[PDB]
Amino acid sequence: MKFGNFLLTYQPPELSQTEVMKRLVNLGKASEGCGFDTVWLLEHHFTEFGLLGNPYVAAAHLLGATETLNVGTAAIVLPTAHPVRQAEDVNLLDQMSKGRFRFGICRGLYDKDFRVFGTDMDNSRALMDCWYDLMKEGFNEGYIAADNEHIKFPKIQLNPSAYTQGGAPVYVVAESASTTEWAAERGLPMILSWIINTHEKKAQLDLYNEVATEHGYDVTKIDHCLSYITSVDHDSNRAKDICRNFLGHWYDSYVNATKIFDDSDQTKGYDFNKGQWRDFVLKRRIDYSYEINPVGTPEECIAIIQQDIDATGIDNICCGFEANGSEEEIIASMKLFQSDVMPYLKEKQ
Amino acid sequence: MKFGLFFLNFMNSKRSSDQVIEEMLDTAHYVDQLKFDTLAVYENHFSNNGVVGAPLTVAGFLLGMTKNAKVASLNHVITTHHPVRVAEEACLLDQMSEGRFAFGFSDCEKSADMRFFNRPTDSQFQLFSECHKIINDAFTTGYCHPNNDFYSFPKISVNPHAFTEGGPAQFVNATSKEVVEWAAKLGLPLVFRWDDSNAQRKEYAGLYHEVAQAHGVDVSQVRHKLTLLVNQNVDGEAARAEARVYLEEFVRESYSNTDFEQKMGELLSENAIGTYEESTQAARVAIECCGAADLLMSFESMEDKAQQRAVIDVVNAN
Ligand SMILES: Cc1cc2nc3c(=O)[nH]c(=O)nc-3n(C[C@H](O)[C@H](O)[C@H](O)COP(=O)(O)O)c2cc1C
């Protein structure tokens, strides 16, 4: 059983940006001591929903300060940055950490990113798809060239080479059937949402496995992750209150981030990304989600997670603890998860 | 004078990119308890002459593994890059290290890189200025809001806000008279480059001082930097032969339009290369020409690691 720690770098209104940044640093360093193998970093721009916009650079820092700890992105917003620059960053992380970087990717949730960085959210799926091929071509061959509909550039030598054969291991944040299939066609592990239930998780997996098997992948050796909002407390109802209050704030912060440019001048500057635009546009609250998350007593946490393991065969459990209050109360929540939940989870029979 | 190290991270057929990155990390670890004050990282793309294209990412790693040295980008190329990414990253580094990052930046030196990243060469200098303007607005206020021909998007908080009031300390690569003048008017420190001639670096130093005077900018407390290569061997002819081989592809890549032998000869006599005596004398001359208050040195052309450390120690000691 592997354990991950999710770090959101969420800014509650009573904390300063400096204090939130110190907590990222500290919580990353505390993680190994609490029995976590991996720290996963979320990307977000411009708003308090999350203050870390560059997980490659924050991963560099934590990997630099550590030896055996793995650090991953959950997730890089793939489309909003140049695929060759990102390949350089991944290889560098891969080289410097000697193989401890985990490369989680998504299409991106917020238009504001596409707006500022100058690319098209309506095209996010095709960009994620194309950027992935170019990166993996660089990881595999040591060179990348593009002559397509989305982007074109001459062949270049990609520096440095990949430490890990085929590049650092890729994970896909996926929660549509189409992103599931995309990941499956590639044999790539998914990081599953903490807002869906066991039945939904199992159905997403069954879908994945169908396509993955057709390609010849061993579906039993793929490092899929269950992700979780987590609040372990001997007082069950206090854990639920803490998480219910947090999920309300974070959801409001998600909403605010979707509306940030709501009444603004839509004028774009120079188009450095010409092939990336499409002519046309494309054609839910989480207040009760603590019920389907390990929020409650250790025993209750054990049962929710074992139920997910038993339905999916996943043995990589990634938990977010930042709903839990001060740095001290987050660490204490991690420590109680470590002592009273970790040792009692078992792999699917 | 403060003294530091920089990393070019050149590779070749027997010295893989894997190997040189490992070398740099070991070197960072070695010098961190010494009196060198800065570790600086060179940016290069698509060739053997530098395997680091993302000096801010490398900076994060170095900062995570070290405790004493400041860590700098040497020449982060802003002209080809999104300035929101740059500002975000440099502020993140500022914040994660609590103020141990210094932001060295550069205009683009290869037009091939401009084309690669679709930045028009006809307007390279105004693009550079606008990129720096956005980065500096973000460093100084936490916000930016461009409305120009290069970048136009709504007002944004650039997160995280800098840990250091005013943002991380900045310096700019002395790459053209136009850039040198721009910097002088802003009161920004320069880095002079190891691969420029002494005459060139002197010309830039003088231009700077004069533009500053003409404009009423107090530059009396501006600390310029110089970079130099160091290769010291009691066999001085061996030091020159080793640096020759190390430098050859570079001179062919970056000075293709200039005479090979004359330029090689100049790099070898003007850099801190040769016997200890020859080496330190070239350093004195190089500093006198440009007026740099801080010296950054690369020792990487010395292939024998134990020899390299011995020269780092001797240099540290005086
Ligand atoms: C663990 C996890 C991490 C996520 N990280 C990010 C992120 O860093 N940036 C972002 O814009 N969205 C993030 N999201 C949302 C995804 O971008 C996306 O909306 C969705 O969950 C799955 O993508 P799909 O629509 O391709 O299926 C995250 C979701 C989860 C469950």
XYZ file of C-alpha atoms and ligand atoms in Angstrom:
698
model
C 0.000 0.000 0.000
C 1.402 3.411 -1.035
C 0.303 6.667 0.544
C 0.270 10.143 -0.920
C -0.246 13.560 0.644
C -2.147 16.169 -1.426
C -1.153 19.766 -0.962
C -3.606 22.382 -2.262
C -1.841 25.594 -1.137
C -5.321 26.958 -0.537
C -5.390 30.412 1.086
C -8.074 30.846 3.802
C -8.858 34.579 4.279
C -7.282 34.691 7.759
C -3.842 33.582 6.423
C -1.395 35.694 4.486
C 0.214 34.466 1.265
C 3.553 34.204 3.124
C 2.012 31.998 5.788
C 0.375 29.760 3.204
C 3.752 29.414 1.424
C 5.543 28.450 4.705
C 2.887 25.758 5.220
C 3.547 24.271 1.747
C 7.257 24.086 2.599
C 6.647 22.643 6.042
C 3.949 20.180 5.120
C 6.070 18.798 2.285
C 8.952 18.228 4.738
C 6.669 16.653 7.386
C 5.149 14.084 4.975
C 7.825 11.347 4.897
C 7.938 11.260 8.731
C 4.195 10.573 8.697
C 4.489 7.446 6.499
C 3.719 9.167 3.162
C 5.750 7.978 0.106
C 4.681 10.835 -2.224
C 3.690 14.472 -1.935
C 1.293 15.620 -4.719
C 1.037 19.309 -5.656
C -2.011 21.070 -7.185
C -1.603 23.885 -9.771
C -3.694 27.066 -9.602
C -3.256 30.658 -10.760
C -4.333 34.130 -9.792
C -6.643 33.219 -6.917
C -6.734 32.036 -3.311
C -8.243 28.670 -4.383
C -4.592 27.628 -4.593
C -1.482 29.828 -4.602
C 0.940 27.452 -6.353
C 0.860 28.067 -10.073
C 4.111 26.287 -10.921
C 4.288 22.759 -9.447
C 7.468 21.879 -11.453
C 9.377 24.519 -9.490
C 7.799 23.702 -6.106
C 8.545 19.991 -6.783
C 12.165 20.918 -7.549
C 12.382 22.596 -4.143
C 10.895 19.649 -2.149
C 12.805 17.100 -4.166
C 16.003 19.144 -3.526
C 15.349 19.053 0.261
C 14.697 15.301 0.252
C 16.257 11.974 -0.697
C 13.769 9.114 -0.970
C 10.485 11.040 -0.964
C 8.567 11.165 -4.285
C 6.909 14.373 -5.380
C 4.253 14.616 -8.066
C 1.927 17.072 -9.725
C -1.820 16.578 -9.330
C -2.053 18.077 -11.773
C -0.119 20.107 -14.304
C -2.492 22.021 -16.535
C -0.861 20.611 -19.679
C -2.334 22.862 -22.493
C -1.370 26.246 -21.004
C 2.372 25.869 -21.360
C 4.696 25.074 -24.230
C 5.237 21.345 -24.608
C 9.045 21.618 -25.182
C 9.576 23.861 -22.121
C 7.533 21.337 -20.056
C 9.608 18.394 -21.397
C 12.806 20.143 -20.290
C 11.284 20.757 -16.835
C 10.139 17.087 -16.484
C 13.548 15.705 -17.543
C 15.419 18.096 -15.234
C 13.201 17.075 -12.300
C 13.683 13.429 -13.328
C 17.493 13.871 -13.487
C 18.032 15.998 -10.344
C 15.795 13.821 -8.161
C 17.045 10.608 -9.726
C 13.634 9.305 -10.664
C 11.457 10.618 -7.847
C 9.237 12.946 -9.931
C 5.650 11.850 -10.753
C 4.097 13.664 -13.655
C 0.301 14.103 -13.089
C -1.544 15.940 -15.958
C -5.011 17.348 -16.608
C -6.736 19.437 -19.390
C -7.369 22.338 -16.951
C -10.487 23.497 -15.080
C -10.310 27.298 -15.391
C -10.654 29.530 -18.423
C -8.698 32.334 -16.689
C -5.497 30.319 -17.226
C -6.191 29.898 -20.901
C -7.037 33.605 -21.088
C -3.800 34.862 -19.519
C -1.401 32.313 -21.006
C -3.063 32.827 -24.370
C -4.563 29.641 -25.526
C -8.012 28.146 -26.122
C -9.958 26.280 -23.422
C -12.424 24.982 -26.002
C -9.414 23.121 -27.457
C -8.072 21.774 -24.154
C -8.558 18.075 -25.006
C -6.818 18.175 -28.373
C -3.944 20.304 -26.854
C -3.501 17.883 -23.940
C -3.482 15.046 -26.419
C -0.955 16.715 -28.755
C 1.342 18.057 -26.003
C 1.457 14.539 -24.480
C 2.642 12.936 -27.765
C 5.333 15.605 -28.298
C 6.567 15.265 -24.658
C 6.619 11.483 -24.804
C 8.414 11.638 -28.149
C 11.081 13.827 -26.466
C 11.290 11.448 -23.414
C 11.630 8.423 -25.758
C 13.857 9.764 -28.561
C 15.787 12.685 -27.095
C 14.354 14.980 -29.767
C 11.031 16.587 -30.533
C 9.678 18.010 -33.830
C 6.195 19.297 -34.653
C 4.427 19.790 -37.998
C 0.764 19.670 -37.117
C -2.533 21.554 -36.921
C -1.878 22.742 -33.350
C 1.769 23.637 -33.345
C 4.806 23.534 -35.591
C 8.509 23.839 -34.827
C 11.697 22.324 -36.242
C 13.334 19.307 -34.716
C 15.302 20.049 -31.588
C 17.600 18.182 -29.278
C 15.771 17.935 -25.941
C 18.083 18.453 -22.902
C 18.717 16.721 -20.486
C 17.872 13.088 -21.308
C 15.248 11.269 -19.274
C 16.529 9.615 -16.108
C 13.516 7.249 -16.230
C 13.121 5.208 -19.443
C 10.158 6.696 -21.376
C 10.287 9.783 -19.157
C 9.012 10.359 -15.630
C 5.873 8.303 -14.865
C 2.697 10.062 -16.120
C -0.657 10.084 -14.210
C -3.874 11.420 -15.587
C -6.487 13.281 -13.603
C -9.604 11.885 -15.315
C -13.328 12.216 -14.648
C -14.856 11.997 -18.071
C -15.261 8.802 -20.080
C -13.249 10.402 -22.834
C -10.219 11.190 -20.570
C -10.453 7.665 -19.057
C -10.250 6.095 -22.528
C -7.476 8.477 -23.532
C -5.460 7.317 -20.463
C -6.355 3.674 -21.033
C -5.147 3.744 -24.726
C -1.806 4.761 -23.275
C -1.676 2.376 -20.337
C -1.441 5.344 -17.965
C -2.569 5.366 -14.304
C -5.387 7.627 -13.287
C -5.923 9.659 -10.166
C -9.579 9.242 -9.306
C -11.827 12.002 -8.035
C -12.795 12.252 -4.346
C -16.229 13.596 -5.311
C -17.560 10.425 -6.893
C -18.729 7.278 -5.123
C -17.542 3.684 -5.038
C -20.020 2.694 -7.692
C -18.784 5.533 -10.016
C -15.127 4.667 -9.292
C -15.665 1.023 -10.175
C -17.507 1.951 -13.406
C -14.681 4.346 -14.447
C -12.199 1.563 -13.793
C -14.226 -1.107 -15.688
C -14.292 1.314 -18.630
C -10.569 1.963 -18.363
C -9.731 -1.715 -18.134
C -11.735 -2.640 -21.275
C -9.681 -0.289 -23.485
C -6.420 -0.948 -21.658
C -6.783 -4.738 -22.168
C -7.500 -4.269 -25.912
C -4.085 -2.557 -26.174
C -2.390 -5.444 -24.321
C -1.662 -3.573 -21.073
C -1.607 -5.525 -17.808
C -4.444 -3.837 -15.971
C -3.275 -5.278 -12.640
C 0.095 -3.507 -12.747
C -1.171 0.071 -13.327
C -0.607 2.577 -10.455
C -4.109 4.153 -10.244
C -4.671 6.396 -7.187
C -7.724 6.954 -5.006
C -7.793 10.514 -3.901
C -9.491 11.750 -0.710
C -10.343 14.746 1.451
C -9.343 13.338 4.811
C -10.180 14.204 8.421
C -9.574 11.575 11.021
C -10.729 12.371 14.561
C -11.906 10.150 17.481
C -14.763 12.594 17.591
C -16.589 11.638 14.394
C -18.894 14.668 14.165
C -16.140 17.193 14.752
C -14.268 15.685 11.764
C -17.444 16.022 9.641
C -18.020 19.679 10.725
C -14.440 20.690 9.921
C -14.689 19.085 6.425
C -18.268 20.341 5.686
C -17.139 23.933 6.589
C -13.986 23.624 4.411
C -15.803 22.147 1.371
C -18.200 25.076 1.471
C -15.345 27.612 1.442
C -13.355 25.862 -1.226
C -16.380 25.449 -3.459
C -17.103 29.191 -3.136
C -13.515 29.855 -3.949
C -13.838 27.515 -7.056
C -16.880 29.542 -8.168
C -15.084 32.861 -7.675
C -12.152 31.596 -9.770
C -14.532 30.723 -12.651
C -15.947 34.248 -12.653
C -12.795 36.319 -12.184
C -12.730 37.955 -15.661
C -16.555 38.140 -15.687
C -16.994 41.704 -16.984
C -13.569 42.366 -18.544
C -12.019 43.593 -21.833
C -11.771 40.413 -23.905
C -8.964 41.850 -26.113
C -5.987 39.511 -26.594
C -2.413 40.627 -27.249
C -0.015 39.106 -29.692
C -0.854 35.560 -30.777
C 2.275 33.546 -29.980
C 0.118 30.307 -30.148
C -1.549 30.673 -33.578
C -2.359 26.974 -34.286
C -3.911 26.442 -30.849
C -7.276 28.300 -31.390
C -10.627 26.893 -32.527
C -13.213 28.983 -34.316
C -16.098 27.639 -32.224
C -17.108 27.332 -28.595
C -18.011 23.923 -27.137
C -21.789 23.034 -27.005
C -22.286 20.802 -9.068
C -22.048 21.298 -5.315
C -19.943 19.055 -3.072
C -21.353 19.840 0.423
C -22.142 16.212 1.294
C -18.985 14.682 -0.148
C -17.465 14.079 3.313
C -19.899 11.140 3.515
C -17.911 9.320 0.768
C -14.505 10.360 2.094
C -12.431 9.237 5.107
C -13.904 11.859 7.439
C -14.730 10.461 10.908
C -13.085 8.084 13.356
C -10.168 5.870 12.277
C -12.624 2.916 11.998
C -14.902 4.905 9.750
C -11.912 5.976 7.640
C -10.771 2.381 7.357
C -14.183 1.218 6.163
C -14.665 3.946 3.481
C -11.186 3.351 2.042
C -11.365 -0.454 2.218
C -14.672 -0.311 0.416
C -12.941 1.667 -2.451
C -9.898 -0.660 -2.503
C -12.205 -3.717 -2.612
C -14.161 -2.377 -5.599
C -11.239 -1.088 -7.604
C -8.055 -3.003 -6.693
C -6.162 0.294 -6.159
C -3.329 0.281 -3.610
C -2.216 3.926 -3.900
C -4.148 6.163 -1.461
C -3.694 9.960 -1.784
C -5.146 12.094 1.017
C -5.623 15.807 1.454
C -5.402 16.978 5.079
C -5.509 20.780 4.713
C -9.198 21.116 5.756
C -7.915 20.440 9.283
C -6.911 23.900 10.485
C -3.528 25.162 11.628
C -0.285 23.634 10.435
C -0.208 21.849 13.819
C -3.719 20.402 13.432
C -2.996 19.220 9.848
C 0.145 17.435 11.018
C -1.788 15.859 13.917
C -4.485 14.698 11.517
C -1.700 13.133 9.269
C -0.191 11.493 12.325
C -3.517 9.902 13.441
C -4.135 8.699 9.888
C -0.607 7.201 10.002
C -0.986 5.435 13.341
C -4.661 4.348 13.257
C -5.660 4.075 9.547
C -2.536 3.209 7.419
C -1.661 -0.103 9.134
C -5.214 -1.489 8.743
C -5.799 -0.969 5.026
C -5.267 -4.170 2.983
C -4.937 -4.784 -0.771
C -7.979 -6.300 -2.493
C -8.159 -10.112 -2.078
C 34.112 41.829 -3.745
C 31.749 38.886 -3.276
C 32.521 35.686 -5.240
C 30.196 32.911 -6.397
C 29.872 30.015 -8.796
C 27.946 29.484 -11.999
C 27.058 26.377 -13.926
C 27.103 26.273 -17.720
C 26.445 22.502 -17.661
C 28.102 21.792 -21.069
C 27.907 18.126 -22.206
C 29.666 16.117 -24.909
C 29.814 12.535 -26.227
C 31.543 11.071 -23.156
C 29.989 13.414 -20.547
C 26.271 12.889 -20.665
C 23.634 15.359 -19.562
C 22.889 12.935 -16.688
C 26.605 13.223 -15.610
C 26.917 17.038 -15.749
C 23.703 17.578 -13.780
C 25.037 15.250 -11.127
C 28.315 17.171 -11.165
C 26.569 20.450 -10.582
C 24.582 19.117 -7.625
C 27.710 17.634 -6.016
C 29.469 20.913 -6.626
C 26.638 22.883 -5.054
C 26.853 20.608 -1.990
C 30.630 20.920 -1.848
C 30.799 24.728 -1.870
C 27.830 25.400 0.411
C 29.892 25.482 3.600
C 32.519 27.658 1.906
C 32.541 31.444 1.488
C 31.130 31.598 -2.090
C 28.020 33.655 -1.817
C 25.950 32.748 -4.948
C 25.241 29.638 -7.074
C 24.089 30.801 -10.563
C 22.507 28.709 -13.335
C 22.952 29.219 -17.086
C 20.025 28.799 -19.498
C 20.554 27.090 -22.889
C 18.312 25.166 -25.306
C 18.744 22.489 -28.002
C 22.532 21.962 -28.001
C 25.366 20.427 -26.065
C 26.437 23.792 -24.714
C 24.165 23.804 -21.671
C 21.686 21.107 -20.702
C 19.551 23.353 -18.509
C 16.700 25.159 -20.327
C 14.715 25.982 -17.154
C 17.097 27.719 -14.717
C 14.241 28.633 -12.306
C 13.398 24.942 -11.904
C 17.029 24.095 -11.235
C 17.152 27.054 -8.828
C 14.321 25.445 -6.773
C 16.211 22.215 -6.460
C 19.450 23.905 -5.457
C 17.673 26.029 -2.940
C 15.997 22.891 -1.481
C 19.344 21.155 -1.033
C 21.534 23.963 0.174
C 21.268 26.209 3.237
C 23.840 29.044 2.897
C 24.357 30.104 -0.755
C 22.097 32.423 -2.558
C 20.886 30.903 -5.788
C 20.458 32.837 -9.026
C 19.348 32.418 -12.591
C 22.302 33.729 -14.537
C 20.528 34.691 -17.788
C 16.835 33.593 -17.655
C 15.644 34.469 -21.170
C 12.465 36.460 -20.741
C 12.006 37.565 -24.367
C 10.883 34.078 -25.602
C 8.743 33.249 -22.475
C 5.425 34.218 -20.906
C 6.240 36.944 -18.244
C 3.420 35.742 -16.033
C 5.182 32.347 -15.771
C 8.443 34.073 -14.987
C 7.017 36.337 -12.324
C 5.043 33.517 -10.743
C 8.116 31.340 -10.630
C 10.559 33.908 -9.364
C 8.107 34.920 -6.587
C 7.576 31.244 -5.725
C 11.341 30.822 -5.410
C 11.502 34.008 -3.347
C 8.813 32.601 -1.064
C 9.891 28.966 -0.729
C 13.450 29.974 0.174
C 12.477 33.041 2.182
C 14.532 35.382 0.073
C 17.622 33.345 -1.039
C 16.814 33.608 -4.807
C 18.262 36.358 -7.077
C 16.743 36.962 -10.466
C 19.313 37.190 -13.273
C 17.664 37.673 -16.623
C 18.567 38.151 -20.246
C 17.287 39.118 -23.641
C 17.439 36.304 -26.266
C 20.899 35.738 -27.811
C 19.902 33.225 -30.566
C 17.389 34.368 -33.182
C 16.702 30.677 -33.777
C 15.219 30.544 -30.241
C 12.994 33.617 -31.026
C 11.638 31.888 -34.125
C 11.246 28.576 -32.268
C 8.920 30.208 -29.700
C 7.238 32.521 -32.294
C 8.491 35.809 -30.939
C 9.037 38.317 -33.752
C 12.660 39.445 -34.164
C 11.765 42.863 -35.678
C 10.348 43.908 -32.287
C 12.642 41.953 -29.942
C 13.718 44.874 -27.824
C 10.203 46.248 -27.145
C 8.990 42.717 -26.392
C 11.895 42.345 -23.875
C 10.941 45.671 -22.215
C 7.263 44.785 -21.972
C 8.112 41.366 -20.518
C 10.282 43.010 -17.850
C 7.565 45.598 -17.159
C 4.999 42.895 -16.348
C 7.497 40.917 -14.214
C 8.456 44.114 -12.324
C 4.890 45.201 -11.809
C 4.231 41.763 -10.311
C 7.395 41.854 -8.141
C 6.606 45.349 -6.801
C 2.799 45.241 -6.431
C 1.604 41.629 -6.549
C -0.370 42.521 -9.745
C -0.056 43.086 -13.381
C -2.404 44.305 -16.096
C -0.833 44.787 -19.515
C -2.708 46.397 -22.412
C -0.222 46.500 -25.239
C 0.495 44.901 -28.562
C 2.435 41.986 -26.992
C 0.329 41.170 -23.926
C -3.228 42.230 -23.125
C -5.313 40.507 -20.476
C -7.250 41.580 -17.392
C -5.727 42.607 -14.024
C -4.348 39.615 -12.043
C -2.817 38.833 -8.673
C 0.436 37.064 -9.514
C 0.753 34.357 -6.831
C 2.394 33.881 -4.504
C 3.280 37.581 -3.751
C 7.005 38.150 -3.301
C 8.484 37.385 0.053
C 11.024 40.171 -0.453
C 9.552 43.639 -0.599
C 10.109 44.744 -4.187
C 10.666 41.102 -5.290
C 13.919 39.131 -5.542
C 17.015 41.221 -6.384
C 17.468 41.536 -10.191
C 20.365 41.814 -12.597
C 20.474 41.837 -16.392
C 22.768 40.170 -18.899
C 24.902 42.789 -20.733
C 24.034 41.562 -24.239
C 23.646 44.778 -26.298
C 24.171 48.544 -26.019
C 20.398 48.884 -26.123
C 19.914 46.620 -23.118
C 22.821 48.233 -21.222
C 21.231 51.673 -21.714
C 17.778 50.453 -20.643
C 19.309 48.986 -17.453
C 21.336 52.136 -16.668
C 18.151 54.241 -16.884
C 16.522 51.802 -14.479
C 19.507 51.660 -12.101
C 19.697 47.862 -12.638
C 22.914 45.904 -12.060
C 24.492 44.134 -15.016
C 26.138 40.835 -15.339
C 29.061 40.941 -17.775
C 29.697 37.700 -19.541
C 32.737 35.501 -19.623
C 32.513 34.995 -23.362
C 32.622 38.722 -24.214
C 35.997 40.312 -24.835
C 37.452 42.561 -22.139
C 37.012 45.459 -24.615
C 33.362 44.695 -25.091
C 32.774 44.460 -21.311
C 34.616 47.773 -20.841
C 32.570 49.428 -23.531
C 29.366 48.227 -21.769
C 30.631 49.325 -18.350
C 31.378 52.798 -19.745
C 28.110 53.151 -21.614
C 26.263 52.214 -18.450
C 28.040 54.825 -16.300
C 27.453 57.558 -18.854
C 23.762 56.866 -19.555
C 23.344 56.797 -15.770
C 25.058 60.217 -15.303
C 23.118 61.766 -18.261
C 19.822 60.719 -16.620
C 20.481 61.538 -13.000
C 20.330 57.883 -11.848
C 22.364 57.229 -8.688
C 24.320 54.038 -9.586
C 26.912 54.462 -6.822
C 25.591 51.444 -4.892
C 24.965 49.255 -8.009
C 26.996 46.011 -7.755
C 27.656 44.704 -11.313
C 28.686 41.089 -11.709
C 31.203 39.505 -13.958
C 31.385 35.833 -14.899
C 34.662 34.145 -15.725
C 35.866 30.637 -16.398
C 38.523 29.247 -14.064
C 40.882 26.421 -14.964
C 44.097 26.378 -12.882
C 46.950 23.914 -13.279
C 50.613 24.264 -12.328
C 51.029 22.993 -15.952
C 49.554 26.124 -17.523
C 49.715 24.718 -21.064
C 47.548 21.755 -19.872
C 44.972 24.178 -18.462
C 44.724 25.940 -21.890
C 44.542 22.623 -23.812
C 41.739 21.333 -21.595
C 39.698 24.560 -21.796
C 40.263 24.575 -25.561
C 38.578 21.206 -26.048
C 35.762 22.186 -23.577
C 35.075 25.411 -25.397
C 35.319 24.246 -29.047
C 31.648 23.362 -29.891
C 30.567 26.547 -28.038
C 32.813 28.795 -30.116
C 31.499 27.060 -33.236
C 27.851 27.439 -32.078
C 27.875 30.963 -30.578
C 30.709 32.703 -32.591
C 30.198 31.087 -36.012
C 30.439 34.459 -37.810
C 33.863 35.275 -36.285
C 37.355 33.759 -36.735
C 37.654 30.511 -34.731
C 41.337 30.592 -33.732
C 41.421 34.282 -32.840
C 38.320 34.014 -30.628
C 39.470 30.788 -28.894
C 42.857 32.427 -28.183
C 41.114 35.425 -26.713
C 38.739 33.375 -24.452
C 41.806 31.388 -23.217
C 43.994 34.420 -22.329
C 41.212 36.640 -20.966
C 39.407 34.021 -18.810
C 41.002 32.967 -15.504
C 42.792 30.060 -17.127
C 46.415 28.876 -16.835
C 48.807 28.626 -13.871
C 47.478 30.132 -10.543
C 49.579 33.213 -11.338
C 48.251 33.512 -14.961
C 44.682 32.720 -13.897
C 44.378 35.280 -11.055
C 46.165 37.933 -13.146
C 43.550 37.548 -15.921
C 40.838 37.884 -13.255
C 42.333 41.205 -12.009
C 42.494 42.578 -15.542
C 38.899 41.445 -16.302
C 37.491 43.111 -13.166
C 39.421 46.351 -13.767
C 38.034 46.576 -17.320
C 34.323 46.297 -16.373
C 34.267 47.515 -12.781
C 32.357 44.494 -11.440
C 31.923 44.315 -7.664
C 31.128 40.579 -7.675
C 32.817 37.765 -9.478
C 31.095 34.514 -10.514
C 33.356 31.624 -11.544
C 32.841 28.323 -13.352
C 35.382 25.560 -12.618
C 33.645 23.020 -14.819
C 36.285 22.753 -17.555
C 38.553 20.956 -15.114
C 37.581 17.334 -15.718
C 39.581 15.934 -12.856
C 37.204 16.414 -9.939
C 39.946 16.227 -7.232
C 41.940 18.960 -9.114
C 38.806 20.989 -9.449
C 38.088 20.928 -5.668
C 41.718 21.830 -4.941
C 41.369 24.976 -7.071
C 37.985 25.802 -5.485
C 39.712 25.495 -2.051
C 42.670 27.688 -3.032
C 40.277 30.259 -4.459
C 38.110 30.091 -1.350
C 41.187 30.568 0.818
C 42.244 33.809 -0.820
C -6.821 15.081 -7.538
C -7.265 16.169 -8.470
C -6.389 17.187 -8.846
C -6.799 18.196 -9.712
N -5.902 19.183 -10.064
C -6.255 20.227 -10.916
C -5.332 21.237 -11.261
O -4.210 21.287 -10.784
N -5.685 22.251 -12.107
C -6.956 22.304 -12.627
O -7.265 23.229 -13.394
N -7.859 21.303 -12.279
C -7.541 20.264 -11.432
N -8.475 19.259 -11.115
C -9.666 19.066 -12.046
C -9.336 18.488 -13.446
O -8.634 19.454 -14.237
C -10.588 18.054 -14.265
O -11.587 19.056 -14.211
C -11.349 16.762 -13.899
O -11.272 16.426 -12.530
C -11.011 15.547 -14.757
O -10.665 15.899 -16.077
P -11.498 15.398 -17.376
O -12.634 16.384 -17.612
O -10.525 15.357 -18.521
O -12.098 14.036 -17.103
C -8.101 18.221 -10.221
C -8.971 17.186 -9.831
C -8.561 16.166 -8.957
C -9.473 15.035 -8.549
